[PDB]
PDB file of C-alpha atoms and ligand atoms in Angstrom:
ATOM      1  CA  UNK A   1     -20.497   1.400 -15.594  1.00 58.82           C
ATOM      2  CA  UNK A   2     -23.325   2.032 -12.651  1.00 61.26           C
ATOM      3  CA  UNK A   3     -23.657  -2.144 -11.626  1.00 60.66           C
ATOM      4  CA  UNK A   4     -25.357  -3.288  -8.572  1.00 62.77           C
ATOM      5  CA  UNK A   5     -22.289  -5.897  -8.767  1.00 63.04           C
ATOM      6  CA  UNK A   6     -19.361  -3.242  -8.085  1.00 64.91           C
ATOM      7  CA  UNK A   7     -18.133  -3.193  -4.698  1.00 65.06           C
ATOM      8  CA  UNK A   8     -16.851   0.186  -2.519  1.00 63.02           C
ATOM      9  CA  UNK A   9     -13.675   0.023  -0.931  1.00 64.68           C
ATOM     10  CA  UNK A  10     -13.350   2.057   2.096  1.00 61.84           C
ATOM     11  CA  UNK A  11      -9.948   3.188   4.402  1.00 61.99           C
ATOM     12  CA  UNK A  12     -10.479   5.121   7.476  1.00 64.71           C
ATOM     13  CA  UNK A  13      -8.075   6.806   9.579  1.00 66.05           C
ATOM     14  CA  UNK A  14      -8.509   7.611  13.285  1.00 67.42           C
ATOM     15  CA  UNK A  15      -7.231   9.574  16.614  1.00 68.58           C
ATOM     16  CA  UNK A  16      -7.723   5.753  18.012  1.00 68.32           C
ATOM     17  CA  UNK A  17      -9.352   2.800  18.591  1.00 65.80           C
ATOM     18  CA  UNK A  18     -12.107   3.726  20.300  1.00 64.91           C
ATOM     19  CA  UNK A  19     -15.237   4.508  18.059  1.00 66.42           C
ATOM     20  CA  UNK A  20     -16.407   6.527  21.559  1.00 68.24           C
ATOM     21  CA  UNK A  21     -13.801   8.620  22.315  1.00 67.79           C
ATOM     22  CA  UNK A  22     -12.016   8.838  18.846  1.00 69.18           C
ATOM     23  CA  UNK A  23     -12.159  10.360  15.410  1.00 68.92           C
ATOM     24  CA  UNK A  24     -12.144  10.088  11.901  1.00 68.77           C
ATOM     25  CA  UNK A  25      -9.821  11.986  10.339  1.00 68.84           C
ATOM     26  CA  UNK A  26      -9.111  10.590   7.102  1.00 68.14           C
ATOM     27  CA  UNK A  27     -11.476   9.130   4.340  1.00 70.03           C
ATOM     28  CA  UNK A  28     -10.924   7.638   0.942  1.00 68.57           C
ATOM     29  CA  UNK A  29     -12.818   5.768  -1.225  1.00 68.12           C
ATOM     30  CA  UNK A  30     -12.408   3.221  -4.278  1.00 71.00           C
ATOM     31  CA  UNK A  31     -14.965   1.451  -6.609  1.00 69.94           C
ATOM     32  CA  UNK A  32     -14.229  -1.251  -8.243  1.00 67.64           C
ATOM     33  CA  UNK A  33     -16.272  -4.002 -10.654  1.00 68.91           C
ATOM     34  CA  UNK A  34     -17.194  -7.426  -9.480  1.00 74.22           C
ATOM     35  CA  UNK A  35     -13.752  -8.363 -10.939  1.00 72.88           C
ATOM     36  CA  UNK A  36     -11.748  -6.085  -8.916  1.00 73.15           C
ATOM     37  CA  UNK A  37     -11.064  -3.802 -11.838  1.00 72.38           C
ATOM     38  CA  UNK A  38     -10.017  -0.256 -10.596  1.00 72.73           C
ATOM     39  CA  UNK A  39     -13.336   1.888 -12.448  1.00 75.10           C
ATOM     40  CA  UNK A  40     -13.190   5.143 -10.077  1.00 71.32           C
ATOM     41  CA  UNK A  41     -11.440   6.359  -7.205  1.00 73.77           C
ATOM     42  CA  UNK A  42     -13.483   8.527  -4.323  1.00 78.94           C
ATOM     43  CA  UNK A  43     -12.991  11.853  -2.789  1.00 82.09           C
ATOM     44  CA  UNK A  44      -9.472  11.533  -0.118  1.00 83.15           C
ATOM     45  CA  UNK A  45     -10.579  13.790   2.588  1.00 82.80           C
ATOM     46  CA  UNK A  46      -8.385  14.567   5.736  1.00 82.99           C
ATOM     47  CA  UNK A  47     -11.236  15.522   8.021  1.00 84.20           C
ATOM     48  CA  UNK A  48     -10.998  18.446  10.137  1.00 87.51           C
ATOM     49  CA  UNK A  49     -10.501  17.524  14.180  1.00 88.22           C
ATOM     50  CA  UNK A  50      -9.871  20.095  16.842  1.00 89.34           C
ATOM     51  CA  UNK A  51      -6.705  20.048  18.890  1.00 86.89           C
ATOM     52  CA  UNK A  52      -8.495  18.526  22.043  1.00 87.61           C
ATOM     53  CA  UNK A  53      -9.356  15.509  19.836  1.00 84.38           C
ATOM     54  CA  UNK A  54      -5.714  15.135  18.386  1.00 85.06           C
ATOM     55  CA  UNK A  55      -4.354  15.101  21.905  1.00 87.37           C
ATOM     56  CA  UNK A  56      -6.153  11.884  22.831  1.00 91.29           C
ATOM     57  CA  UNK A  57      -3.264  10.320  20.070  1.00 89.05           C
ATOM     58  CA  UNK A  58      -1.099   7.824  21.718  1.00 88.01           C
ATOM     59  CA  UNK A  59       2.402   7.475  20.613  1.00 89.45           C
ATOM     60  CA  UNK A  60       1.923   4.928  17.541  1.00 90.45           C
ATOM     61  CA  UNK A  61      -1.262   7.234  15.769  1.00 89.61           C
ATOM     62  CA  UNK A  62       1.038  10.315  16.784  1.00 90.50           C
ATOM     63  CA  UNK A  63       3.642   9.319  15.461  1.00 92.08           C
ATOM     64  CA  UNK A  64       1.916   7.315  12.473  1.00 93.09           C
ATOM     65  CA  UNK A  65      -0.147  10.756  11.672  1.00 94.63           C
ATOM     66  CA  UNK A  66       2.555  13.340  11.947  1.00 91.52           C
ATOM     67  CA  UNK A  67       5.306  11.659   9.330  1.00 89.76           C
ATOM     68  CA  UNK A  68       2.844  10.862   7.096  1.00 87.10           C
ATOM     69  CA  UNK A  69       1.542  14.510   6.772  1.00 88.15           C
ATOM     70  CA  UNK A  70      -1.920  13.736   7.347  1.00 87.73           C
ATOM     71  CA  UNK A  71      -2.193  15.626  10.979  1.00 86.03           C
ATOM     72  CA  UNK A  72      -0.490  19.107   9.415  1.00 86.29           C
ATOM     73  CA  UNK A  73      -3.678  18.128   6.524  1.00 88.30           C
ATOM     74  CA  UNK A  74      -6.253  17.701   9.368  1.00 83.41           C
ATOM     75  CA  UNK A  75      -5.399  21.089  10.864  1.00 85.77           C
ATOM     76  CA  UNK A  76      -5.870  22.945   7.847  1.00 90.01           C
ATOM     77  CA  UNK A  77      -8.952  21.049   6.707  1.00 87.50           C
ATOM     78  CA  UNK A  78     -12.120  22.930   6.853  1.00 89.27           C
ATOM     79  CA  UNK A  79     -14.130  19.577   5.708  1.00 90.90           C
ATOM     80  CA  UNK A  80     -16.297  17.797   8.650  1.00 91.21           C
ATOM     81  CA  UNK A  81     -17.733  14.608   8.649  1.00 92.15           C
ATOM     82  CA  UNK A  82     -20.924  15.291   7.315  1.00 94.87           C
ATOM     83  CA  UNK A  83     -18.915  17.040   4.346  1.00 95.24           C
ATOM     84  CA  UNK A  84     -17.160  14.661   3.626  1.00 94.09           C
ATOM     85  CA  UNK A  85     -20.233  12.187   4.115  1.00 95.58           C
ATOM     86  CA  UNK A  86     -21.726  14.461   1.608  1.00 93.57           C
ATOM     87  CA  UNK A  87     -19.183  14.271  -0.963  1.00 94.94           C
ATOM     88  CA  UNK A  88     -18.686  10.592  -0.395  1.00 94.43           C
ATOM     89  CA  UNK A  89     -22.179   9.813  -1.241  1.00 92.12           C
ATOM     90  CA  UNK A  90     -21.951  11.908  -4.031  1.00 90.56           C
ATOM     91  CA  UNK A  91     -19.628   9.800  -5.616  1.00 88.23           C
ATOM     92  CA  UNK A  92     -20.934   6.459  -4.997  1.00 87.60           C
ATOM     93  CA  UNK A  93     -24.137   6.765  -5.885  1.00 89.65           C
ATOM     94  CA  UNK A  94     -22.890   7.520  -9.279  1.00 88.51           C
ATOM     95  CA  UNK A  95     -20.929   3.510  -9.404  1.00 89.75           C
ATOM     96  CA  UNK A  96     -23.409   1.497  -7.486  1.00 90.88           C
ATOM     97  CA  UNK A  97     -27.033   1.663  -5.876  1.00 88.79           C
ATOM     98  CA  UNK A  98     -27.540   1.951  -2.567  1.00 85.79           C
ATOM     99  CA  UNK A  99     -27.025  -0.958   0.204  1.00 88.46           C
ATOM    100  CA  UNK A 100     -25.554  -3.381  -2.438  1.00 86.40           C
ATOM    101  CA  UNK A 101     -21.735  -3.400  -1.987  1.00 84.89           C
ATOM    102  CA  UNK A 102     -20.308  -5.204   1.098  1.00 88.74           C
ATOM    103  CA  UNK A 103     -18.045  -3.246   2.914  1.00 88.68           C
ATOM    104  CA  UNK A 104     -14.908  -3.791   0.880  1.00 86.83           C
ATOM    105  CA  UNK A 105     -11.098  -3.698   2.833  1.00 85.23           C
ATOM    106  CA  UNK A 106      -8.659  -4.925   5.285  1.00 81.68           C
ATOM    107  CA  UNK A 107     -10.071  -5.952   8.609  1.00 81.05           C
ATOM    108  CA  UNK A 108     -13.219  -3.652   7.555  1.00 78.76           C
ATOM    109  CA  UNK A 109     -15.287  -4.347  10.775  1.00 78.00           C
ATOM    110  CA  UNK A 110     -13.437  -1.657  12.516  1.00 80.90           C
ATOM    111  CA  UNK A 111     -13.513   1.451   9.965  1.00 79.51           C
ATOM    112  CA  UNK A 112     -17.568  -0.048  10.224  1.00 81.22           C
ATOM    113  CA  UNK A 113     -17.927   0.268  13.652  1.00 81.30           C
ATOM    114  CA  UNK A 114     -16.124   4.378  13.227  1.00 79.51           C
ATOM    115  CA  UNK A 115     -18.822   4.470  10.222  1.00 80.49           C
ATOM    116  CA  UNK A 116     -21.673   3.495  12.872  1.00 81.51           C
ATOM    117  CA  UNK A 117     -21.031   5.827  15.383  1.00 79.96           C
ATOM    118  CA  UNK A 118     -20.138   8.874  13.405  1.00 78.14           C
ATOM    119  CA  UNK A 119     -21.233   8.234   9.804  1.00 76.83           C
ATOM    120  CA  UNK A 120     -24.291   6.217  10.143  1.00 76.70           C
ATOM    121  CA  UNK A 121     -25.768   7.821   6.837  1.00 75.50           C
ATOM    122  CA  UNK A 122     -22.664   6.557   4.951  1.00 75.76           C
ATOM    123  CA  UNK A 123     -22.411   3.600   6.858  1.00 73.50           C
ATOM    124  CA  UNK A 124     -26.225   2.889   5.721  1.00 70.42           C
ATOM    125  CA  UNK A 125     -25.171   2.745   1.765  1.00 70.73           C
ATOM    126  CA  UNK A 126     -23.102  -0.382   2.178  1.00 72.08           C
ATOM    127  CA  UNK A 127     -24.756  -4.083   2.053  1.00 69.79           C
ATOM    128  CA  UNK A 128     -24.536  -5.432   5.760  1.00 66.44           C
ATOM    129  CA  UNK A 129     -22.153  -8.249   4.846  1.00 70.04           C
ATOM    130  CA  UNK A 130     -18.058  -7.523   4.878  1.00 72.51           C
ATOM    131  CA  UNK A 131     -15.607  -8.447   2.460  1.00 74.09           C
ATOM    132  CA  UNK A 132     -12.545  -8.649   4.621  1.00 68.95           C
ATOM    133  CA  UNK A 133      -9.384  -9.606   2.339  1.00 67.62           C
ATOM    134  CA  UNK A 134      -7.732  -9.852   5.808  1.00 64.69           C
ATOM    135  CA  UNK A 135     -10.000 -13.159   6.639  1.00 62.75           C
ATOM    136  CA  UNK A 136      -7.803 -14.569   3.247  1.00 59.93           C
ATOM    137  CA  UNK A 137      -4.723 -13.049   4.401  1.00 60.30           C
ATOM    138  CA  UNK A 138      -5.460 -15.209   7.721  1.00 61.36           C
ATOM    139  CA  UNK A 139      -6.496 -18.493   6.253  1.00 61.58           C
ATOM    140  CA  UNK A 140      -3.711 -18.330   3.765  1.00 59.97           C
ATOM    141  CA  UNK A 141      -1.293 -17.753   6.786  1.00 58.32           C
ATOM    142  CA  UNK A 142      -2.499 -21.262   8.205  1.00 56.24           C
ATOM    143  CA  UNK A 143      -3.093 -23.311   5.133  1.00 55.77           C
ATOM    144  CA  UNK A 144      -0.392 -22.754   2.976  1.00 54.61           C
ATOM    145  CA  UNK A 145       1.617 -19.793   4.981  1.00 55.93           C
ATOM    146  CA  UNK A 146       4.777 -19.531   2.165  1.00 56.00           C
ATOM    147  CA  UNK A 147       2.285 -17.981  -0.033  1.00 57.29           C
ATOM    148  CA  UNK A 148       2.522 -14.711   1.854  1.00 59.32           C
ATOM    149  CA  UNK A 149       5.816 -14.024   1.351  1.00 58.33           C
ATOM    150  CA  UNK A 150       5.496 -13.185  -2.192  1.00 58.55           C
ATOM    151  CA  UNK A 151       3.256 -10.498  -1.318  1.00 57.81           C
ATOM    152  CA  UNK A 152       4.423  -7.418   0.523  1.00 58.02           C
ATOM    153  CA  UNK A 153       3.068  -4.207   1.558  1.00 57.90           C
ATOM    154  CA  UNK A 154       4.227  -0.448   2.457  1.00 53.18           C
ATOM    155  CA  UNK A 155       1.206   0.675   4.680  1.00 57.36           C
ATOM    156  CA  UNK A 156       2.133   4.247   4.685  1.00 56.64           C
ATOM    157  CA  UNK A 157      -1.767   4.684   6.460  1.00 54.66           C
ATOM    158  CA  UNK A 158      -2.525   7.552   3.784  1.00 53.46           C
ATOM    159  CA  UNK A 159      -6.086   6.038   3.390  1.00 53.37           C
ATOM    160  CA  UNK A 160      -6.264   5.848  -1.011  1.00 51.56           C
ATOM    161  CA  UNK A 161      -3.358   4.276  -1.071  1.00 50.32           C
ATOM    162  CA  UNK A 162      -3.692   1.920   1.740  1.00 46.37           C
ATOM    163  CA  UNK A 163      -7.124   0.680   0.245  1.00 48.82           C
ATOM    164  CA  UNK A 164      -5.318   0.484  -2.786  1.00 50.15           C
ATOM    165  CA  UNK A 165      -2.601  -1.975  -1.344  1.00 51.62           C
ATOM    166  CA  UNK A 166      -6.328  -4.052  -0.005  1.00 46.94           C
ATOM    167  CA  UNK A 167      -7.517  -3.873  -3.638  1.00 46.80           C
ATOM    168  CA  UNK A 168      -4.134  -5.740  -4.761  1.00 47.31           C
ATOM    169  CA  UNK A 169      -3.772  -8.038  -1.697  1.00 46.04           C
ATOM    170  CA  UNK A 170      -7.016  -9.563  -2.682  1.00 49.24           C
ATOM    171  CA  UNK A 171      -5.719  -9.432  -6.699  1.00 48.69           C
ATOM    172  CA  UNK A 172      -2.930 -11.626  -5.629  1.00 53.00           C
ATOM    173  CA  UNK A 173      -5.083 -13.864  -3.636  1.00 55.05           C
ATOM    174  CA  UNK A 174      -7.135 -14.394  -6.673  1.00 55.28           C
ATOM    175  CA  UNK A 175      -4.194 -15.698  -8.604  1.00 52.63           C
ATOM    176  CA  UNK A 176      -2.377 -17.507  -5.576  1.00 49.15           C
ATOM    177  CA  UNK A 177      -5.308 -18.693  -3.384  1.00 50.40           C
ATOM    178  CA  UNK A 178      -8.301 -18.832  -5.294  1.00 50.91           C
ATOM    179  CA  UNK A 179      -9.194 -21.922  -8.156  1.00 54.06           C
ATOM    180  CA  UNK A 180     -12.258 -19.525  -9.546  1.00 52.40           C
TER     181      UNK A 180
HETATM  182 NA1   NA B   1      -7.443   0.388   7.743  1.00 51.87          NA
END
């Protein structure tokens, strides 16, 4: 099912907002078809990050990170970023070719600029443009705003299933939104 049509979906999770000073510590990965059809999900990888780099957490990713069990996850890692670039790649390049896929989530220029900075090789496999089902979540907010309340969302920030919840905010745009 290898298609230079299918698009990646990508979820980060950080220490912060700061591409500079923060870190990645949480990858996961979906492909789907053109259609949005679900075909393979990627590796989920809580990335390993030294205590110095957990400290720079403010409240909200402290907070965020420790009920969700992804910081006890990070400690016991022993996956780095260029692992889990490794195994990411290995995946995709089994669903689509190289630099075709837009970036594919929820206000995706951000987890881009983390992918920049301190996965450039990963970062490199995606088409430049952005599919951002946030931009629809926006106009549909100011053209027709009731729409949104039949659509809801748990954002528990574990990254799979957060990209997930992307994946079926831009199904039920399709259906609500869209006339194609
Ligand atoms: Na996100």
């Amino acid at each position: 099912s290898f298609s230079d049509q299918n698009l990646i979906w990508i979820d980060l999770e950080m220490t912060g907002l700061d591409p500079e000073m923060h870190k990645i510590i949480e990858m996961a990965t979906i492909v789907t078809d053109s259609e949005l059809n679900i075909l393979a999900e990627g590796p989920v990888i809580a990335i390993h990050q030294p205590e110095s780099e957990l400290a720079k957490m403010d409240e909200w990713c402290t907070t965020t990170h420790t009920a969700s069990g992804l910081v006890a996850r990070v400690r016991q890692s022993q996956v780095s970023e260029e692992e889990a670039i490794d195994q990411t790649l290995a995946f995709l390049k089994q669903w689509v070719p190289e630099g075709k896929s837009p970036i594919c989530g929820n206000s995706i220029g951000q987890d881009r600029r983390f992918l920049y900075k301190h996965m450039p090789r990963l970062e490199a496999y995606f088409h430049y443009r952005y599919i951002d089902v946030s931009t629809i979540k926006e106009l549909t907010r100011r053209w027709q705003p009731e729409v949104l309340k039949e659509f809801s969302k748990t954002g528990s920030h574990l990254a799979l299933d957060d990209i997930r919840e992307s994946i079926a905010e831009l199904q039920f745009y399709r259906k609500a939104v869209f006339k194609i």
